[PDB]
Amino acid sequence: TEIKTKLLSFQTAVSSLADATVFAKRKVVGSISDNPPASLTVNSGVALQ
């Protein structure tokens, strides 16, 4: 039971990394769509600064 849970949990990480979630985008914090306290946003092709 325990080990199967380990494989299930490990299996999830394997599942997680199957996804190329990481994308070819410049990287910065903040993307909320409606009524956040505040956010300035920039995107995936910017000259980095």
Binding site: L17, A18, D19, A20, A24
Partner: protein
């Protein structure tokens, strides 16, 4: 990790290819359903040249590829062309040729 950086900078596509490969769309299958000779042949340019016309509102007939609008204004065979081309058979054969 330097290898991880290497492969991505070397080639992200193959690097993604290890996790996944590519985005998949629905198979592009659709039909021009009804065409026959003599439907618009003289609004079409059955004159051989470009003397005939057909009515349209702009964007009544157009291609979109890569979200960019694409062209419908030359023969794939290279002869005289218009958006309302010579004949029904010629226009639609040229596109497949295109």
């Amino acid at each position: 990790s330097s290898k991880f950086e290497q492969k991505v900078k070397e080639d992200p596509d193959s690097t993604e290819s290890f996790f996944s490969n590519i985005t998949k769309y629905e198979d592009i299958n659709h039909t021009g359903e009804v065409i026959k000779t003599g439907s618009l042949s003289k609004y079409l340019n059955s004159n051989g040249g470009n003397t005939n016309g057909l009515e349209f509102k702009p964007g009544d007939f157009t291609i979109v590829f890569n979200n960019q609008t694409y062209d419908l204004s030359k023969n794939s065979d290279g002869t005289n062309f218009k958006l309302t081309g010579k004949t029904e058979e010629e226009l639609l054969q040229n596109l497949a040729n295109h």
